[PDB]
C-alpha cells in the first residue's frame, strides 16, 4: 500500500538477522519516521516464499502482532523490501539478560504471546519459529510477535503442514522432528519453550540448545535430531527455571506433552495465563 521511496531511506543500524533475512532500522525522511526494514539475505525456494511471507504480515491486524507499514521497490537486492514499525525496546532474548523483570510482567508477556498466536491460528497460519528472539518489547507492558519468516498456511483439508539446516529443532515437538508434520499444537510446544526462556531471563547457559546439547553430547554425527527425538520420547524435558512456580512449570510441561492432542490450544491458554498473571500481580 504505502510505497516507501528507496531514496528517502536512511540506514541507522542493523537490528538482527534470521534464517533467510536481515532487519535494519531506517529513518524515512523525504526532507531532513523510524521504520524497521526486512530484506532477503538465499536460495530460489525461499525467494518464491518471500512474497507469501509479505502477504502473511499484510493481512494480520492484531495488537500483539508487529505492524506492517508497506513495501518498497528494492533494486538493492532485486526482491521486495518489507517495511514495519520499529518496536523500540527490541527482542526479549536481547532485553531479558540485562533487565531483571518480575514474575508478574513475565506472565503478562506470556499471555500476550498466546493472544497473538491464537489470532494467527484463527487465520489458518502456523508460525514454526516461536522463540523469545521473535518476541519484541514495545514497552514494559506490551509485547508483539515480530517475525514471520517460517510462517505457513495450513492446507484447508489437513490439520498440518508438511515440512532443512535452519530449522529451530530445539523449539520443536517430536512430530515435527520425526514425521516432519507441523500442527497448530506444534506451535504450542514452542510456546512452552518460549515460556521457559522467559523464566530463565534468556540466560545463555540456561538456553534450550545449551541444555539439550548437555543431554545429547556434541559428538553425535548427523544424529543430534534423532538423539533429541528419542530423549523427548523417553519423557525428558528442560529443567524447572529457578524461582519459576511449580504450577507454571506444570503448565509448561502440559505444552510439552508428546501426544499433540493432549496439549492445550492457545485459546485454552489465554484465561489460564490471565488468572496466573492476576495472582502474581499482587
Q: In angstroms, what is the minimal distance from the CB of 127 to ligand UWM? A: 11
Q: Which of 36, 54, 65, 252 binds ligand UWM (CB under 6 A)?
A: 36
**Which residue in the set 121, 127, 128, 133 belongs to the binding site for ligand UWM (CB under 6 A)?**
133
- Take residue 134 and report the three cell numbers written for it: 521473535
Interaction between residue 193 and ligand UWM (CB under 6 A): no
3-class secondary-structure state, position 204: helix
Coil, strand or helix: which one is 87?
Answer: coil
Number of other CB atoms surrounding residue 259 within 10 Å: 10
CA dihedral (269, 271, 277, 280) positive or negative: negative
Residue 35 marked as a ligand binder? no
129 labelled catalytic = yes
The one among 18, 116, 192, 208 contacting ligand UWM by CB under 6 A = 18
C-alpha closest to that of 99 among 236, 203, 181: 203
**How far is residue 145's CA from residue 127's CA, in Å, rounded to a whole number?**
10
CA dihedral 138, 139, 143, 144 (to 10 degrees): -10
The verdict on whether residue 152 carries a ligand-binding annotation is no
Out of 9, 106, 107, 136, the residue judged to bind ligand UWM by CB under 6 A: 136
Please give the grid coordinates belonging to residue 140.
514494559
Does 64 help bind ligand UWM (rule: CB under 6 A)?
no
Task: Candidates 9, 15, 193, 195: give the one binding ligand UWM (CB under 6 A).
Answer: 15
Task: Looking at the chain, list the stretches that DSSP marks H as alpha helix, in order from N- to C-terminal side.
Answer: 44-58, 92-95, 103-122, 174-178, 184-199, 208-216, 224-233, 246-255, 266-280
70 binds ligand UWM (CB under 6 A): no
Tell me whether residue 155 or residue 209 sits nearer to ligand UWM (CB atom). 209
Burial 8-20 (b: 16+ CB within 10 A, else e): ebeeeeebbebbb
**Binding range to ligand UWM, per CB under 6 A, among 87-95, 112-120, 161-169, 237-245:** 87-95
147 near ligand UWM, judged by CB under 6 A = yes
Q: State the minimum distance, in angstroms, from the CB of residue 203 to ligand UWM.
A: 19
Residue 280 CB, shortest distance to ligand UWM, in Å, is: 26
Q: Which stretch binds ligand UWM (CB under 6 A): 2-10, 141-149, 160-168, 215-223?
A: 141-149
Q: Which residues pair with 137 in a beta bridge?
A: 143
Which of 94, 129, 140, 164 is flagged as catalytic?
A: 129
217 phi/psi in degrees, rounded to 5:
100, 160
Nearer to ligand UWM, 86 or 212 (CB): 86
Torsion angles phi and psi, residue 110, rounded to 5: -60, -45
Residue of minimal Cβ distance to ligand UWM: 16
Q: β-pairing, 68-72 with 2-3? A: parallel
146 binds ligand UWM, rule: CB under 6 A = yes
- Asked if 149 is part of the footprint of ligand UWM (rule: CB under 6 A), the reply reads yes
Give the residue ranges of the annotated binding site: 15-23, 38
Task: Give the residue ranges of the annotated binding site for ATP.
Answer: 15-23, 38
User: Which parts of this chain interact with ligand UWM (CB under 6 A)?
Assistant: 15-18, 21-23, 36, 38, 84, 86-91, 133-134, 136, 146-147, 149
Residues with catalytic function:
129
Amino acid at each position: 500500500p504505502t510505497v516507501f521511496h528507496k531514496r528517502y531511506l536512511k540506514k541507522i543500524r542493523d537490528l538482527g538477522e534470521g534464517h533467510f533475512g536481515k532487519v535494519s532500522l531506517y529513518c524515512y525522511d523525504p526532507t531532513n519516521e523510524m521504520v524497521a526494514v526486512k530484506a532477503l539475505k538465499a536460495g530460489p525456494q525461499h525467494r518464491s516464499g518471500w512474497k507469501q511471507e509479505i502477504d502473511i504480515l499484510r493481512t494480520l491486524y492484531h495488537e500483539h502482532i508487529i505492524k506492517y507499514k508497506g513495501c518498497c521497490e528494492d533494486a538493492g537486492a532485486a526482491s521486495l523490501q518489507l517495511v514495519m514499525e520499529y518496536v523500540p525496546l527490541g527482542s526479549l532474548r536481547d532485553y531479558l539478560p540485562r533487565h531483571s523483570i518480575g514474575l508478574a510482567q513475565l506472565l503478562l508477556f506470556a499471555q500476550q504471546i498466546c493472544e497473538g498466536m491464537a489470532y494467527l491460528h484463527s487465520q489458518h497460519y502456523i508460525h514454526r519459529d516461536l522463540a523469545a528472539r521473535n518476541v519484541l518489547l514495545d514497552n514494559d507492558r506490551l509485547v508483539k510477535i515480530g517475525d514471520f519468516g517460517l510462517a505457513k498456511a495450513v492446507p484447508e483439508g489437513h490439520e498440518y503442514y508438511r515440512v532443512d539446516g535452519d530449522s529451530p529443532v530445539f523449539w520443536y515437538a517430536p512430530e515435527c522432528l520425526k514425521e516432519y508434520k507441523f500442527y497448530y499444537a506444534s506451535d504450542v510446544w514452542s510456546f512452552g519453550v518460549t515460556l521457559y526462556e522467559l523464566l530463565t531471563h534468556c540466560d545463555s547457559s540456561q538456553s534450550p540448545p545449551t541444555k539439550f546439547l548437555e543431554l545429547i553430547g556434541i559428538a553425535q554425527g548427523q544424529m543430534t535430531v534423532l538423539r533429541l527425538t528419542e530423549l523427548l520420547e523417553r519423557g525428558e524435558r528442560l529443567p524447572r527455571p529457578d524461582k519459576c512456580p511449580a504450577e507454571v512449570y506444570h503448565l509448561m510441561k502440559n505444552c510439552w506433552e508428546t501426544e499433540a492432542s493432549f496439549r492445550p490450544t492457545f485459546e485454552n491458554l489465554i484465561p489460564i495465563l490471565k488468572t496466573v498473571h492476576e495472582k502474581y500481580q499482587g
